[PDB]
Design a protein around this ligand. Structure first.
Ligand code: HEM
Ligand SMILES: N[C@@H](Cc1c[nH]c[nH+]1)C(=O)O
Length: 413
């Protein structure tokens, strides 16, 4: 009844319980082995643990649609619903959760200033930021890299990539917390109202921003591109999409990059053999970043909704079934990555990982994310080669999909 026990554990599988929150891929290890797809009543979702299954679902966006990708995990308590009503909150489809025949692709296909030229100049900008930030703290014995640079720089880069004027960054930061906890977390009774207020204000803020940018067609930045495309094809790049993407993209353009950068530095600073290999051969850094993204990426689980009945590896899904694609688990799938739990900085197929998704909705900013992670690690390993982690407890914001340590305490000469 060891398998019987596994089925009960799967029925009860709670992503907010300790094992998932300690290590999502490790918590699903038995399931990769003997119960790869199972339904959790604890959270109303199918759980998909294996590399081939997760990829297969990503590959078919007509059967498995992205509509729930930004859907609020736990239902809003009624008094939260009217806080949102006060702000006339209207978040609907952006890109990552748009569903369509081409309306997803039409909108995607018609919005590229991810050209390498444009990313090249943003790279220069990232490098100036990281040089000056560590100019500030290099003199200290210790620092928490998160608070010195790891969230602030990706945020600034994002604002700059978008056409969005910097202002209160601690305010922008808590806006992002409210959006992610609301969506992917399980806020307690006390917080649900505050989070709703925060989410509502976030919506209102993005409104005022989009309105000012609408009025400055001089502007350059990705949001100015959308605004422009909306004037030409308001069918496709819709006004609600503008407002919805504003708020969604103002978290997504930086938060996963900051979490991932903290994960990578945590990983590499702990394997001293790996770190001096990085210190001695910065050529290895991109391939190392890719192995970090596979091993401990910042997105650990993404979501799909089933639109017609279907089956994957012997399990049939009903129209309306919700699926968790646990990409952390797929990236530790022994069936696809040999010694999957090990940090091998030239695993030759590290890039086959699924942290960026696969197929239609595959992350458009993956190279911005990669670029920021390399510069962080290059700068740090170049100028502080004796960098080491301090003894510390690591804490994680409890949610289903995003993962990175809140602090990264670290010391040197
Ligand atoms: C380490 C950093 C990042 C990670 C792990 C990440 C992860 C993801 C994932 C899992 C998806 C969904 C993939 C799928 O459904 O197949 C996605 C889509 C997307 N990402 Fe990211 N992301 C990161 C950084 C960024 C940045 C910096 C930007 C923009 C500046 C960005 C923009 C987008 C967009 C627009 C989409 C939607 C594209 C579409 O729906 O077709 N991401 N990302
Ligand atoms: N919010 C997630 C995924 C996403 C939202 N919008 C586009 N992609 C991220 O930051 O990676």
């Amino acid at each position: 009844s060891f398998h019987a026990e596994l089925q009960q554990k799967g029925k009860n599988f709670d992503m907010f319980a300790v094992p998932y929150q300690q290590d999502p891929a490790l918590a699903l290890k038995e399931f990769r082995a003997q119960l790869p797809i199972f339904f959790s009543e604890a959270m109303g979702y199918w759980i998909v643990t294996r590399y081939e299954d997760v990829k297969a679902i990503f590959r078919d966006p007509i059967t498995f649609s992205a509509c729930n990708a930004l859907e609020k995990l736990t239902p809003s308590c009624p008094e939260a619903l009217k806080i949102l009503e006060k702000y006339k909150y209207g978040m609907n489809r952006t890109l990552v959760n748009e569903d369509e025949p081409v309306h997803m692709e039409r909108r995607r296909a018609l919005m590229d200033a991810f050209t390498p030229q444009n990313l090249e100049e943003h790279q220069h900008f990232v490098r100036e930021l990281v040089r000056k930030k560590v100019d500030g703290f290099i003199y200290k014995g210790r620092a928490d890299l998160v608070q010195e640079m790891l969230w602030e720089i990706p945020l600034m880069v994002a604002l700059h990539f978008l056409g969005v004027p910097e202002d209160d960054m601690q305010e922008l930061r808590k806006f992002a917390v409210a959006h992610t906890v609301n969506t992917w977390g399980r806020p307690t009774l006390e917080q649900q109202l505050e989070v709703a207020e925060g989410v509502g204000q976030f919506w209102e803020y993005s409104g005022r921003v989009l309105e000012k940018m609408k009025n400055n067609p001089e502007g350059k930045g990705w949001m100015y591109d959308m605004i422009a495309k909306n004037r030409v094809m308001p069918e496709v790049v819709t006004d609600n999409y503008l407002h919805s993407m504003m708020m969604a993209i103002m978290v997504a353009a930086h938060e996963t990059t900051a979490l991932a950068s903290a994960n990578a530095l945590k990983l590499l600073l702990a394997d001293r053999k790996v770190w001096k290999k990085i210190c001695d051969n910065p050529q290895l850094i991109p391939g190392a970043v890719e192995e970090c993204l596979r091993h401990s990426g910042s997105v650990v689980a993404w979501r799909r909704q089933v639109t017609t009945e279907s089956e994957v590896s012997g399990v049939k899904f009903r129209k309306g079934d919700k699926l968790f694609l646990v990409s952390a688990s797929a990236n530790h799938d022994e069936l696809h990555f040999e010694n999957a739990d090990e940090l091998d900085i030239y695993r030759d197929n590290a890039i086959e990982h699924l942290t960026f998704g696969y197929g239609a909705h595959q992350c458009m900013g993956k190279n911005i994310g990669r670029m920021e992670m390399c510069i962080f690690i290059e700068e740090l390993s170049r100028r502080i080669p004796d960098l080491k982690l301090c003894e510390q407890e690591f804490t994680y914001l409890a949610n289903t999909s995003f993962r990175g340590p809140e602090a990264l305490w670290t010391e040197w000469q």
